[PDB]
């Protein structure tokens, strides 16, 4: 709501809004990091015959 | 040097020949501490880009008609820890230098 | 009308087929082959000694 607090468009605030959705997709990247960890931990092992 | 000493390899004048492009080391699938917990080596996978060629007959210097390039998997080479050691079967082993 | 044990043969074949399916599945997912990386663990089993009298 601070991010969606309305103000007249400068170029700097619009580029920093683009960088705000860039941390949103970085948050999506951390989500995929968590998924990459849990697929390693959850999966069973191979063993000796 | 080990790949320039052997390759290219060719048949008994059958004009089928295997030559060498380049190599690459894959990323380690397992990092160090849990590798020491679980039991495996601290390996690294290997990729070799090979280019199988076969010539056109009745022209040994003639242009090959079939080239086929792949990243063939071969072996696992162990990397080195930051402390100079190796990891073999869960444990940690050192290679001693030789005086000959 | 002679004697008959065809139902016995069908029953015995049913037992053999069901047991062969179950044992084939167990020997399929217990002696599998690990792929491209090898055995990801180790057995580590060791047996010590005891003090066994001999009366």
- B92-93 and B86-87: which strand pairing? antiparallel
* Neighbouring C-alpha atoms within 13 Å toward the C-beta of A26: 6
- Asked whether the CA dihedral A25, A26, A31, A33 is positive or negative, the reply is positive
Closest to B80 measured CA to CA, from B22, B2, B28: B28
Q: If contacts are CB pairs under 8 Å, which of residues 8-37 in chain C contact chain A? A: 31-35, 37
| Helix or strand run (H / E) with residue B45 | strand B45-54
Closest to B42 measured CA to CA, from B56, B31, B53, B55: B31
**Interface contact A47-C40, CB threshold 8 A:** yes
Closest to B71 measured CA to CA, from B31, B40, B25, B16: B25
Measured in angstroms, the CA of C46 and the nearest CA of chain B are apart by 16
SS3 letters for A1-49?
Answer: CCCCCCCCCCHHHHHHHHHHHHHHHHHHHHHHHHHHHHHHHHCCCCCCC
Closest to B74 measured CA to CA, from B26, B38, B28: B26
Query: Which chains does B contact via 3+ CB–CB distances below 8 A?
Result: C
Structure tokens at B36: 């020491």
Residue entry with tokens 């056109």: B56
Cβ-defined contacts of B30-37 (< 8 Å, 24+): B32/B81, B32/B87, B35/B87, B35/B90, B36/B87, B36/B90, B36/B91, B36/B92, B37/B90
φ, ψ (nearest 5 deg) of residue B83: -100, 15
- Resolution in A, one decimal? 3.7
Return the SS3 of C29. helix
Technique that determined the structure:
cryo-EM
What does the alpha-carbon distance between residue B24 and residue B45 come to, in Å, rounded to a whole number? 9
């Amino acid at each position: 709501r601070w991010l969606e607090l309305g103000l007249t468009d400068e170029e700097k605030q619009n580029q920093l809004e683009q960088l705000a959705e860039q941390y949103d997709e970085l948050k999506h990247e951390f989500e995929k990091k968590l998924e990459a960890k849990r697929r390693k931990i959850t999966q069973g092992d191979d063993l000796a015959p | 040097a080990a790949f320039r000493s052997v390759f290219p390899i060719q048949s008994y004048s059958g004009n089928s020949e295997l030559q060498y492009v380049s190599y690459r080391l894959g990323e380690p699938v397992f990092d160090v501490q849990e590798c020491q917990i679980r039991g495996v080596t601290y390996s690294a996978p290997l990729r070799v880009k090979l280019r199988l060629v076969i010539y056109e007959r009745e022209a040994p210097e003639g242009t090959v008609k079939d080239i086929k390039e792949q990243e063939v998997y071969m072996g696992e080479i162990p990397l080195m820890t930051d402390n100079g050691t190796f990891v073999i079967n869960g444990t940690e082993r050192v290679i001693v230098s030789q005086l000959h | 009308n002679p004697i008959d044990l065809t139902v016995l043969a069908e029953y015995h074949k049913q037992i053999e087929s069901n047991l062969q399916r179950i044992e084939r599945k167990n020997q399929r997912t217990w002696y599998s082959k690990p792929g491209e990386r090898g055995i990801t663990c180790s057995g580590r089993q060791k047996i010590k000694g005891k003090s066994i009298p001999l009366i």
